[PDB]
Write a protein that binds this ligand. Structure first.
Ligand SMILES: *[C@@H]1O[C@H](CO)[C@@H](O[C@@H]2O[C@H](CO)[C@@H](O[C@@H]3O[C@H](CO)[C@@H](O)[C@H](O)[C@@H]3O)[C@H](O)[C@H]2NC(C)=O)[C@H](O)[C@H]1NC(C)=O
Length: 305
């Protein structure tokens, strides 16, 4: 049946227009469309990562209360996903920063995470994602923020959910051993840590180009991260990946997913970047019915569902 435990998609919109905080719904940001989500569920996708902004969720100070409108619109999406039996990944899409400044106190972060997790604590299908793509920060501080997220989450009473932790250097697979070897030390009472890495297939590994450097680069860029997972006895999920709608990229995505599936003892699954209702013309749009990656990649991806 399934090549992995999890295969699915990011659902973007709540994190758009981050230059506008709080911003206005329908103008600067939107929430994902549950009808399109249901289309992806019917196709067989069982995990959806949902980005949002920390500043819109808990304004002013991350130790404060939740914004009612933003939490309501967001958790409507989360509860739609889990109500259908799929996993919903709660993604603070904040790059380790809060109002632009790198986060530097584990207490405020932990209190943020208690406040947020308390709202989902009895939902076994929610997955908490500590922060999207830490980058250009002190590695020991990145580790400490992942640990503070774990601590705040479990202390909120949310002990049955998986926790996706993310590394420095944009949590890239192809650079994991270069930058995030120190991520081993993370501890969870529930023992439900999964190392979420991201991988794109263009020259700089950012994905801003819809060109892939070769038809085998996807496979090459995940070998070291795989052996790192095995050697240290860790689990991982490729929480973001994508490729341009051309043959070389399609073959690279195929080979990378074949390799990861061969090592499904440590690789728990994958999610495409990205779906959602405001991607019209995006090079990687998984949004049905007419997204480019939905038209060109769905038939490839559904092999692994
Ligand atoms: C949320 O997602 C739903 C489901 O995709 C959106 O509804 C759909 O909107 C599209 C575009 O307006 C409709 O597309 C058309 O379909 C017919 C063929 O059936 C085709 O002749 C046209 O060329 C075009 O492809 C689609 O039928 C429609 N589906 C349903 C069930 O209404 C909806 O607009 C989205 N709402 C948002 C973004 O908030």
């Amino acid at each position: 049946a399934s090549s992995f435990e999890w295969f699915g998609s990011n659902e973007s919109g709540a994190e758009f227009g981050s230059g506008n905080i709080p911003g206005v719904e329908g103008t600067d940001y939107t929430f994902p469309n549950t009808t399109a989500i249901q289309i992806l569920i019917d196709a067989g996708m069982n995990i959806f990562r949902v980005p949002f902004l920390m500043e819109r969720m808990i304004p002013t100070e991350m130790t404060g209360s939740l914004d009612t409108a933003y939490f309501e619109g967001y958790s409507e999406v989360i509860n739609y996903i889990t109500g259908k039996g799929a996993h919903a990944v709660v993604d603070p899409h904040n790059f380790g920063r809060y109002y632009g400044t790198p986060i530097s106190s584990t207490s405020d972060f932990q209190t943020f995470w208690s406040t947020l997790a308390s709202q989902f604590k009895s939902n076994d299908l929610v997955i908490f994602d500590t922060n999207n793509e830490y980058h250009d920060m002190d590695e020991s501080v990145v580790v400490a923020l992942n640990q503070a997220a774990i601590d705040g989450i479990r202390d909120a009473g949310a002990t049955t959910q998986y926790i996706f932790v993310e590394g420095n250097a944009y949590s890239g697979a192809w650079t994991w051993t270069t930058y995030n070897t120190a991520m081993v030390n993370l501890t969870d009472p529930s023992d439900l840590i999964v190392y979420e890495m991201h991988q794109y297939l263009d020259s700089d590994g950012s994905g801003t180009s819809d060109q892939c450097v070769s038809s085998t680069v996807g496979q090459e860029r995940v070998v070291d991260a795989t052996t790192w997972l095995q050697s240290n006895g860790k689990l991982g999920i490729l929480g973001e990946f994508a490729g341009g709608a051309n043959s070389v990229c399609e073959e690279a995505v195929e080979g990378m997913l074949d390799y990861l599936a061969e090592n499904s003892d440590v690789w728990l699954g994958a999610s495409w970047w990205s779906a959602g209702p405001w991607w019209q013309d995006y090079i990687y749009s998984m949004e049905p019915p007419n997204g480019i990656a939905y038209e060109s990649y769905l038939s490839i991806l559904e092999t692994y569902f």
